Paper text:
PRPP is formed from ATP and D-ribose-5-phosphate (R5P) by the phosphoribosyl pyrophosphate synthetases (PRSs). The human PRS family, which has 3 isoforms (hPRS1, hPRS2 and hPRS3), belongs to the class I PRSs that requires divalent metal ions such as Mg2+ as the activator, inorganic phosphate ion for activity, and ATP or dATP as the diphosphoryl donor. Due to the important role of PRPP in the nucleotide metabolic process, the stability of PRPP content is essential for cell physiology and is predominantly controlled by hPRS1, the ubiquitously expressed human PRPP synthetase. Mutations in hPRS1 affect vital cell functions and are related to many diseases and disorders.
2− complex was determined using the MR method to 2.0 Å resolution. More information about the 2.0 Å resolution structure could be found in the supplementary materials (S1). 2− complex structure, the β9–10 strands from Arg196 to Val202, with missing electron density, are possibly structurally and functionally similar to the same region in the Thermoplasma volcanium PRS-R5P complex. We also found that the highly conserved residues Lys194 and Arg196 (located between the β9–10 strands) exist among all 3 classes of PRS. The second motif with conformational change, termed as the flexible loop (from Ile89 to Ile107), exists among all known PRS structures. According to the crystallography symmetry operation, the PRS1 crystal structure appeared as a three-leaf clover like hexahydric ring that matched the apo state of the PRS1 3D-EM structure. We then reconstructed the 3D- EM structure of the PRS1 apo form, which displays the 3-leaf clover structure that matches the PRS1 hexamer model derived from the crystal structure, according to the crystallography symmetry operation. Based on the EM results and the crystal structure, the functional hexamer might be the most efficient functional form. The surfaces of active centers and interfaces are highly conserved according to our surface conservation analysis.
Numbering used by the authors:
A (entry chain A): 3 to 195, 203 to 313
B (entry chain B): 3 to 195, 203 to 317
Write the structure that this text describes.
């Protein structure tokens, strides 16, 4: 009844999920014709089935989005009973408002496309902005890595009871005060005027930079420099989505991070060979459990 | 009231169209981010304007499509009066049916995406299947290269009154009979079974292979061989959309074509440097006219049989 399919070549997360559910990944032929068009071909009947498509990680965000939309549509017109998009890192999430510019709200565009493609349900993790659930009219389950992150901090940072959770920017305030409050410790915040300004106390204490995602890491690496300058004993960086593109990886080694922790919402195995301070939190069990619970009418909010 | 924007940095067609309309291309900040995400920023107000966005021919179809969708979205939420997508070569057009398989109808998906992004109108040329117009509820103007192709044939092939128009496959039948009937000449059809068969006489005549598009060119190259074997004097290939990916340019250089004729719905300039057989028909005037007619409420259908 449950059928799980994986996006293009990135399959490791998808395989882990299927394993936990006692399933094999559904048969599908996903490629790219010589002329760049995405080719998809569902290799088995999905009629009457509860279908979950786990987004890919072939890096190329537009190819991965189109492959997902095409797979959703194929399953819908092949009479699946329901189609859920499992998208650990939601594409174009940062493009979720105009920001005083004549800009697209591409996150809303992405939501409309998923909907017209035929998605009945979305499962995702740590939306850049919670309001993004409002971009849909279908149910969205937005899972949190927070519980996983707290666990990791307690278990890996000896001085954690007196650390400071630090936001790399002004916009990250809510996220870090949330974490600092759960741990009952201090928080502080960095803002780029450029020069960086720090508000809050970090002197002589472990500093943990926490962010929903890191891309070029230019901001997170500068922040690390600032924190050292302000006398933080040691600096960590905790990111739920480790995009790590461009100079990211070399900026990290080249930085003072005692470690950089991310989830496997994005494949990491390649960059871990090029960066020793990277540790990953496996979130396949959360995702698998969201799917089973989604399938069984069981509570998903428990995992929050 | 009229504002024309180009996708990407492959603005040659876009600039040719703007030029013909007496306009500059609208200002857009259009970059791909670190993590592959497309960035777009409309650099001027489009409020109350009749906006036309011309699809870029970069090559990476998924990037070009998303860029277009994002530009449509930006203009719509910036209160343009109307947004028309000008898509010279329609993406995923060859994915317009199931073909007895558990396949997506990706062309219908593309139409839905264009529609939800907010397109009010589509202008395109030579849809792979005319039924694709039915994939929308908004109006689509599907322009034809045929008038420009007929003119090219009459002005470049001495023996056109005695030639045969040839379809490279079963699905191109109507397209070639249409041309053959207008020229008042014969037609022929190739069908691939791992072998080609030809129905229709081409012996001791010039043969013109006509198709909507050529991609890797395996088919037209094999078709030309076949036609020469059947006694054609020589072989031309005329396509509206020259995708020419993979080994196409190599295949063409080795093929027994006298010439391969395409339109500029897809950029050809770089391809031509490596392939002297390619000749290009400029369709910018046809597109510019469809846009001008559309803005003015004048007849676009005039263009279906007449070269502006």
């Amino acid at each position: 009844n449950i059928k799980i399919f994986s996006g293009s070549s990135h399959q490791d997360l998808s395989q882990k999920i299927a394993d936990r559910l006692g399933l094999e990944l559904g048969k599908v032929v996903t490629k790219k014709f010589s002329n760049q068009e995405t080719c998809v071909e569902i290799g088995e009947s999905v009629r009457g089935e509860d279908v979950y498509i786990v987004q890919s990680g072939c890096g190329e965000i537009n190819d991965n989005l189109m492959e997902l939309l095409i797979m959703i549509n194929a399953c819908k017109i092949a009479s699946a009973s329901r189609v859920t998009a499992v998208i650990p890192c939601f594409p174009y999430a940062r493009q979720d408002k105009k920001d005083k510019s004549r800009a697209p709200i591409s996150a809303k565009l992405v939501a409309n496309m998923l909907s017209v493609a035929g998605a009945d349900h979305i499962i995702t993790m740590d939306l850049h902005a919670s309001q993004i659930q409002g971009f849909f009219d279908i149910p969205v389950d937005n899972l949190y890595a927070e519980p996983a992150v707290l666990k990791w901090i307690r278990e890996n940072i000896s001085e954690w009871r007196n650390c400071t959770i630090v936001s790399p920017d002004a916009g990250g305030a809510k996220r870090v005060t949330s974490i600092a409050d759960r741990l009952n410790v201090d928080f502080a915040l960095i803002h780029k005027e450029d020069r960086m300004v720090l508000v809050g106390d970090v002197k002589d204490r472990v500093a943990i930079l926490v962010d929903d995602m890191a891309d070029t890491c230019g901001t997170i690496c500068h922040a690390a420099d600032k924190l050292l300058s302000a006398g933080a004993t040691r600096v960590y960086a905790i990111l739920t989505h480790g995009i790590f593109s461009g100079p990211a990886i070399s900026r990290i080694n080249n930085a003072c991070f005692e470690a950089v922790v991310v989830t496997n919402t994005i494949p990491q195995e390649d960059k871990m060979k090029h960066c020793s301070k990277i540790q990953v939190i496996d979130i396949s069990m959360i995702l698998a459990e969201a799917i089973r619970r989604t399938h069984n009418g069981e509570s998903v909010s428990y995992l929050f």
